[PDB]
Amino acid sequence: MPAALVSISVSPTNSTVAKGLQENFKATGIFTDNSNSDITDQVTWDSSNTDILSISNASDSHGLASTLNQGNVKVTASIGGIQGSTDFKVTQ
């Protein structure tokens, strides 16, 4: 039978990094049926994109974002019902 989400465990990083830097992302979805699943809905991450950045979170399961701009980017993703947000600042 169908179920309804409840919450998700996301460990976003709100900091700044020098030109060229990537980080792994992981999110776990939780259902009201006490049944938790990992990236069940495939948490899709996206960046505001300032200069040139690419994020790949489908290599197998774990997520990964790589920035390469000279400013501030906004990393946001959504999974199932719950979603999260992160702030990243890439310098020169």
Side-chain angles (χ1 to χ4, degrees):
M1 272 96 109
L5 286 113
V6 177
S7 318
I8 55 179
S9 244
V10 283
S11 274
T13 300
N14 52 96
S15 321
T16 173
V17 305
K19 216 181 186 238
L21 226 126
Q22 55 246 226
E23 214 197 86
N24 326 75
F25 270 95
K26 242 275 159 108
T28 318
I30 297 100
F31 288 76
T32 174
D33 196 47
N34 322 120
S35 287
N36 324 134
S37 283
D38 71 297
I39 60 178
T40 174
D41 235 279
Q42 264 42 67
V43 51
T44 308
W45 313 77
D46 221 88
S47 244
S48 181
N49 195 284
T50 309
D51 214 338
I52 173 56
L53 50 90
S54 289
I55 304 184
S56 35
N57 334 75
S59 292
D60 248 316
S61 134
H62 49 238
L64 280 99
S66 79
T67 74
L68 218 308
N69 59 105
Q70 298 140 249
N72 14 59
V73 190
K74 192 73 149 257
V75 178
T76 335
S78 248
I79 174 134
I82 319 102
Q83 80 182 84
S85 32
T86 323
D87 174 64
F88 283 88
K89 188 114 107 216
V90 193
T91 337
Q92 188 164 341

